[PDB]
Amino acid sequence: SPSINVALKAAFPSPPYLVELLETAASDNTTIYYSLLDRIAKGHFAEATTDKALYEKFLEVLRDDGHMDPEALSAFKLALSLRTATPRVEAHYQYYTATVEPSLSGTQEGCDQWFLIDGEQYCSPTLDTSHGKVKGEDQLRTLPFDRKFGVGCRDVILYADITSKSFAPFHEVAMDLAKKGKASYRVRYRRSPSHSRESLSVNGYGVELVLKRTDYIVIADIKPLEKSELAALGMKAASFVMQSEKPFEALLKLTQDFPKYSNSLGSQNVSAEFEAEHRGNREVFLPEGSNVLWLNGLHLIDRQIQPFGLVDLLTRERKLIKSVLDLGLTGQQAVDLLGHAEVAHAKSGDDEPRRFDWRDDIEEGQVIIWLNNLEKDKRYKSFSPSIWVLIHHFGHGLPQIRRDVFNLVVPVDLTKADDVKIVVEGLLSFVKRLIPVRFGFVPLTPTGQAIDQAKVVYYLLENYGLAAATAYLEKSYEEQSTGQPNERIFNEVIKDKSLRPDGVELSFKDIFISEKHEKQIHLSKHWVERLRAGGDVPTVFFDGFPIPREDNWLRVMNHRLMQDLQALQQAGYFGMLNESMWLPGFFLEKALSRRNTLIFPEDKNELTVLNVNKIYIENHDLMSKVPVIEASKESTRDDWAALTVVADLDDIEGQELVYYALRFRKSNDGVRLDIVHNPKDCSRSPSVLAQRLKSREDKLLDFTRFLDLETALETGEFEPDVAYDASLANFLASSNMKAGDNFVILNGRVLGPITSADDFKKEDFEVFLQAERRTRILPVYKALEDLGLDDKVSGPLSAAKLTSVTALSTISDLPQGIFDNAPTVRTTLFKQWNSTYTSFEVGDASTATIFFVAVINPASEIGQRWVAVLKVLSELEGVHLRVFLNPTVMIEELPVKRFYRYVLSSSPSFDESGKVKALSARFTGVPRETLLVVGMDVPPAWLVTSKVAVDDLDNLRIKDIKAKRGTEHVEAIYELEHILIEGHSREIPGAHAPRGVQLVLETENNPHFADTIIMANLGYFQFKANPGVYNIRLKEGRSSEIFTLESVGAKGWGPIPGDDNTEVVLMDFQGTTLYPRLRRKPGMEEEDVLEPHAEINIFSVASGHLYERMLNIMMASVMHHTNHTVKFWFIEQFLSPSFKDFIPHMAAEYGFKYEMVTYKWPHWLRQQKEKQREIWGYKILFLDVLFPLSLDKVIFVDADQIVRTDMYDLVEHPLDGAPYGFAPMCDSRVEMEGYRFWKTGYWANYLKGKPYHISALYVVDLQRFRELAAGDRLRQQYHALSADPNSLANLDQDLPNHMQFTIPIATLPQEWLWCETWCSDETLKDARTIDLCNNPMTKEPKLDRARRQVPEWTKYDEEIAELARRVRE
C-alpha cells in the first residue's frame, strides 16, 4: 500500500539510557533516587549491556525493593516511553558546559569525577590535594534539578560521569560522610564521552493530513463526495461503533481515517436510532457536538490534553487518592467525596467581609486628627447622651445624641486638590449639620511635599488648635490651589489665628522636630501601612468596615450606618447593653489589628496546602519522635482539628510562637498539637531540643509562665538521633521551607514565614481555626456524612487526611484568568446521565484509582486526538474510562477534513539488537489522487520545523511522486528545534500588564541569548530555548530606568517563598511557565512608549515549491538592481527543507546575509484553522516581536514579486512619523471598475477619504512601531473582529485598512507597485516593482503571467536552475 511516514527528533543528543531510567523512576522522591544510586555503585547494573536488558532489570529491582506496585510500574513504562527525563539530564550538561568549565581554570587530566568543597576541587576520594580555587559566582546555589541527601553544615557536590566504573568509590565516600552527618550530599552530571552524538527521537505528538480542496460535494482512489445529507453523519457514525461490539477499536479506526469513510456511512439500515432516547441526556447537561473531558471531576482544557499534561495529572491525583484510601474508602467513594456539591459550594462561598481596629491606641493617639467629639463639643450640648435614644423610634434621617458611637476615619493626601476638597467641603458640612458621626482624617505621606504638609497641619493643631489648622487647609484650597506649603498663605493664618496658642508653646518658622517630624509622620505611616489604607485607591474605615474611596462611598457608609444602628437596637432589647459602656467597642469585639497578613490575604489565590497523610508517611521517622499533645478523649467530631507548629527554638520569635500555640491548646480541647523544631544554625543537632521536649511532653501546657518553656529547652543531656535529623531536612525540602523560618500548619494549610511572633498570637490561632473550620472542615464533614462515610473519621489526625486532600483537589495547576473556560470546580452532574446506549467502559471500576469521563463528538476533528491519547492511557492498569458520544444535527459544511495519527506508546519497544525503537506516524493505504497538506499537532511548548523531506508537504499527491520519483512511499523528518519559556507579567503593587517593556534572556557563556517585548494581553512574552540554566534581565535603557524585577514566577503565581529570583531553568517537555513581577522605581508614573545586519532588511514567506522558486527570483532581482548590502529574513516554519538546504549557496553567489525568524502563535490569541489565513496573520500580527530589538526597520516583499529598483530608496522614504507605509490600489486601468469592491457600501462608508491599500509591499519603521505599541492594537482588534467568521476576507490587507483611523499609514508613491489586472500598460514604464495579483475573472496561473508580463523573469530562473544543478553535481 502507498504509505506516508513522519518522524520527529530533538535538537540535543540522546543521554545514556541508564541515567534516564533512574531519573524517570525517581520523579522527585529522593529516597528512590539514592536507593537506586547505591545499586549501580555496587556494579549491579554493569552486567546489563543492552537497553532492553537494563530496562528489564529495573522492573525486577523496583518490585523487589517495594518502590512500585502494579499501578506505579505501569505508569513508569508510559513515562519512560515519553522520554520525559531526557531534557532533565540535558539541563545538567548545559549547566556544566556553560558555567562549570569556564569557572574551573587549569588543566584537567584524570579528573573525570571531582567533588567541590569550599571552592576547592578534589579529583580523588582520599581528599588530600586540591587542584583549584573556582571562580566567584557560587555553584552552591540550590537550583531546580538538585537533590540533597542528609543534613550537614558543610555542603559537598560531586560532578560525575555515572556510566564508567570510576564513579563507585567516590560516591561511597560522600554517601557515608552524609550518613554520619559531616556534610549534605548532592549529585550533578557530566557529559559522558562513552556515548555517541546521535540525536534523540521523540514521541507524544500528532500528525495530520489535511485535504486542501474541500469544494467538491454534490483500494482508495479519492474520497467519493456524496449529496449534502451531512446532518446524519455524526448520528450514524455513533451507531456504527455501538453496533460493532469492540467499540473502542472501531472509534479509533473510524476517527483516524474518517474523511475516507464518509460515503461508507449511512448503509444497510444504519441509523438504529434507539439513542434518540439519550437526548434526555442532552436536555439536562451538554449541547450536541461538544467535546468535554473530566478527570475525577476536574474539567480539563484542551491544552492539558497531551501525553505530558496527562501523565503529570495522574501522578498528582494518585498521591491524593491513595492518601484517602488508607482510611478504608474505595476509589469510587473517594472521587465521589472530592466532587461533592457542599465542597464546590465552599470555594464559591469564601468571599465574606470583616471589621478592623481603626484606633490610635497602637500609635499612642498621635495620628488621627478629629474634627468632632460628640461628648465634648458644645454643639451637641442640647442633645441627650442616652443609649435608648439610638434604640428607640428614629424616623428615616439620623438620631441625634451626645455620645461616642459612630466613627469615620478617611485618609487624605494634602498635595492633591480633590483630596483636600473632601475635608474642606465634604467633612465640614457634616460637622455643621450636627450629624451623630465623629469625623476623622489621617494624611497620606507618599511624597516630600505631602510629608511637610502633614508636619505643618500637625504642628498648627498641637499648639494653636483645630480651627487654625482648618483655616490653613480652607485658605490653601481656594487661595493657592496647590498641595505644596505656601508661607504667603501660612503666615496670614498665623497673623490672626496666632492669638494665644495655649498649652505647650509655639516654635514657629521651620519644622524638623526630632519628635514631631519623626514620631508623628512615622506613626501616621504605621497606621496607613497597618490597615493598607493607601495607594492608587485609598481605604475609608467606618466602624472598622473598609470602604474604598471610590464612587459614592458615603452612600455605602450610610447603608452600614443604618445597618449598625439596627445591630445596636437588638442588643439593647436583649439587655446586652448598659449605660456605662464604650459603644464603638461593640463592633471592635471581633476586629483584627492588622489588615491583610498571612491568614486573610487580599489575593484570594495566595494559598499553600500539603498532603497530611504524605507528611506522616514519608517522615514517619520524624513525626513519631516530635512532641505530640493528643486531642482530648471526650470531644466531638465537629470540635476535631489537627495543628502542627514549625519553629526555630534558637530564636525568641520561634519559641514565642510555640507558647501561643500551647496557650491556644489549653482552651481548645479538640485540637491535636505537634511541635517541629527548625533551627537556622546546623552546628548543633536539631534532635537534641526535640528530645528535651518529648521528655517534658506529659507536662506540656502546664507552663504558667513563658520562662517555664524556655527553661525546659535548656535543661537535660541528650544523644543526637542523626536518623531524626535526616528525616527533618527531607520534610522541609518536600514542604519548601527554609532553615530558621517559622510556619503554622492547621489541617494541611501552611501560613508563613512568620517574621515576628507578634503577628501570630493566641487570638490569631482562634480565628485561623474558626475560618479554616468553616471553609474546609465543615464542607468535608457535610459531604462525607451525605455519602455515609462518617464512620471512617476516628480522630483529629484521621480527619485532617480527608480535609487536606479535598483542599488540594480545588487548587488549580493553571491560575484562573489566563488560560480558558475551566475553573477549579469538580463537577458530578454527568452521573445523572443514562448510559445504556451511548457509553462504554474500560478497566475495573472497583479497583481503578483514576476515573476518566470523555464526551466526544465522532464528527469532530478534536475528537481524533482525544480518542488516540485516551486509548494509550486506558492501557494503564488501575485506570477506568467511560465514553459518551454526542453528535450534532447542525452540519452546514464537511465535519472532518483530515486524517490523523498520534505517535505514542504505553510501554517502551525494543530493537533486534536491544536498542530502544524510535516512534513514527505511518499512514497506510493513502488515496493516490487526493491533494494533502502535512501538519504537526505538537504540544504547546514545542517549536517544530521540517528538516528532511524531498516532497512538497504543502502539496502532497502520490500519483505525481510515483510518476516523478518512482516511489509510492513518502518519508519526512521534523526537528524539535526549540522549547518555549513563556510567562504572564504583572506590575507591583497596582498589578497591571507592563506593555512595551523589553526583556533579554542570557546564559553565563553569552549575555544575549534572546530578546522579546511584553504584550498588553496578560503581560505575555516568550523565548525560544532548549534545556539549561538561563537568566532574565530587563533590556538596558528605558526599561531598567523605570523598573526593577523582583522575581520571575518560576514556581507559580505566588509569591511562594524562595522564588525571589530571576533565574529560569527548563528541564521538561512542557517548557517553562513563568509569572514575573516588576515594581516601579522611586516615584514613577513614566512610560517607555513616550520619550523623556545590512543596508537593506527585507522579509518574506512562501508556502509551496512554486512560491519558493518565485522567492529565489525575487531575491536575485534585488541583488542585480542594487550596489548595496542586503539581508533577507524568512518565516522559518512555512519553508521546505529543500529551500532551507539551498540558501547558503544563494548567499555565496549573490553576496547577501540571511536569518530565520519565527514566533509561536499565543494560546490566548485566536487560532486559524486554514493555513493560508495563518500565513497572513504572521505578516501583520507579530511584527514587533518577530524581529530582534537591534533591527531599526524591515521591508516586506511578496514571493511572487520582482523588483527593478535599488531598494534603499524605500528606507530613505519619509514616513512622516508613521509606523508603517503601504502602496494604494491602482486606479489607472479604465475598464476594470466592476471588480473594484473597495468603492462599494461597506468599504467606501468605512474608508471615508482614506485609501484601500495593498499588502504585497510595505515598510515597517520597527523602532516607531514598538514605540507606538501598534502590535497590541492589531492583535486585540483581530481577536475581537475574528468572532464573526466572515469578518476579514484577506486579513493582511483588511487589518491595516481597518486600523488606519487609529494607527497612521504612510501612503506610498504608486511608482512602487504595478499589477496588470488594475494598472494600465502605459504605467509599467515608471514602475518600480510588480505584484502578480490574482486573475480574478480568469484562472490563468502565476507561471503564465510571469513569462508574459516580465521578459527578464526567465533570465533569473535560468541562473537559479544551473546553480541548483551545479550544487547537485
Ligand SMILES: *[C@@H]1O[C@H](CO)[C@@H](O[C@@H]2O[C@H](CO)[C@@H](O[C@@H]3O[C@H](CO[C@H]4O[C@H](CO)[C@@H](O)[C@H](O)[C@@H]4O[C@H]4O[C@H](CO)[C@@H](O)[C@H](O)[C@@H]4O[C@H]4O[C@H](CO)[C@@H](O)[C@H](O)[C@@H]4O)[C@@H](O)[C@H](O[C@H]4O[C@H](CO)[C@@H](O)[C@H](O)[C@@H]4O[C@H]4O[C@H](CO)[C@@H](O)[C@H](O)[C@@H]4O)[C@@H]3O)[C@H](O)[C@H]2NC(C)=O)[C@H](O)[C@H]1NC(C)=O
Ligand atoms: C518514595 O520512595 C520510597 C522508597 O522506598 C517508597 O517506598 C516506601 O518506603 C518507605 C520507607 O522509606 C516504606 O516505609 C514503611 O513504613 C512502615 C510503617 O508501618 C508502620 O506504621 C503503620 C502506621 O499506620 C502501622 O499501621 C503499621 O502496622 C506499621 O507498624 C507500626 O505500627 C504502630 C503504629 O505506627 C507502631 O506503634 C509500631 O511500633 C509500628 O512501628 C514500627 O515500625 C516502624 C517502621 O518504620 C518503626 O519506625 C517503628 O519504630 C516500629 O518499629 C514500616 O513498617 C516499614 O518497615 C518495614 O521494613 C522492612 C520491610 O518490610 C522490615 O524489615 C521492617 O521490619 C518493617 O516491617 C514492618 O512492616 C511489615 C509489613 O509491611 C510487617 O510484616 C513487619 O512485621 C514490620 O512491622 C517501612 O519503613 C514503605 O513501605 C515503602 N513502600 C510504600 C509502598 O510506601 C515510597 O512509597 C515513595 N513515595 C511514594 C509517595 O510513593
Ligand SMILES: *[C@@H]1O[C@H](CO)[C@@H](O[C@@H]2O[C@H](CO)[C@@H](O[C@@H]3O[C@H](CO)[C@@H](O)[C@H](O)[C@@H]3O)[C@H](O)[C@H]2NC(C)=O)[C@H](O)[C@H]1NC(C)=O
Ligand atoms: C457594662 O457592660 C458590660 C458588657 O460588655 C458589662 O460586662 C463587663 O465588661 C467588662 C469590659 O468592659 C468585662 O471585662 C473583660 O473581661 C474579659 C473576661 O471575661 C477579659 O478577657 C477582658 O480583658 C476584660 O477584663 C467584664 O468581664 C464584663 N463582666 C463583668 C461581670 O464585669 C459591665 O459589667 C457593665 N458595667 C456595669 C458597671 O455594670
Ligand SMILES: *[C@@H]1O[C@H](CO)[C@@H](O[C@@H]2O[C@H](CO)[C@@H](O[C@@H]3O[C@H](CO)[C@@H](O)[C@H](O)[C@@H]3O)[C@H](O)[C@H]2NC(C)=O)[C@H](O)[C@H]1NC(C)=O
Ligand atoms: C553596480 O555597480 C557598478 C559599478 O559602479 C555599476 O556599473 C556601471 O555600469 C556602467 C555600464 O555602462 C559603467 O560604464 C562603463 O564604465 C567603464 C569604465 O572603464 C567604461 O570603459 C565604459 O565605456 C562604460 O562607461 C559604469 O562605470 C558603472 N558605474 C556607474 C556608477 O554607472 C552598476 O550599474 C551598478 N548596478 C546598479 C543596478 O546600479
Ligand SMILES: *[C@@H]1O[C@H](CO)[C@@H](O)[C@H](O)[C@H]1NC(C)=O
Ligand atoms: C433494517 O434491516 C432489514 C433490511 O431488509 C429489515 O429487515 C429490518 O426490518 C430493518 N430494521 C429496522 C430497525 O429498520
Ligand SMILES: *[C@@H]1O[C@H](CO)[C@@H](O)[C@H](O)[C@H]1NC(C)=O
Ligand atoms: C433515564 O431513563 C429512564 C428510563 O425509564 C427515565 O425514566 C429517566 O428520566 C432518564 N433520565 C435521563 C436523565 O435521561
Ligand SMILES: [Tb+3]
Ligand atoms: Tb531559660
Ligand SMILES: [Tb+3]
Ligand atoms: Tb515576639
Ligand SMILES: [Tb+3]
Ligand atoms: Tb501576490
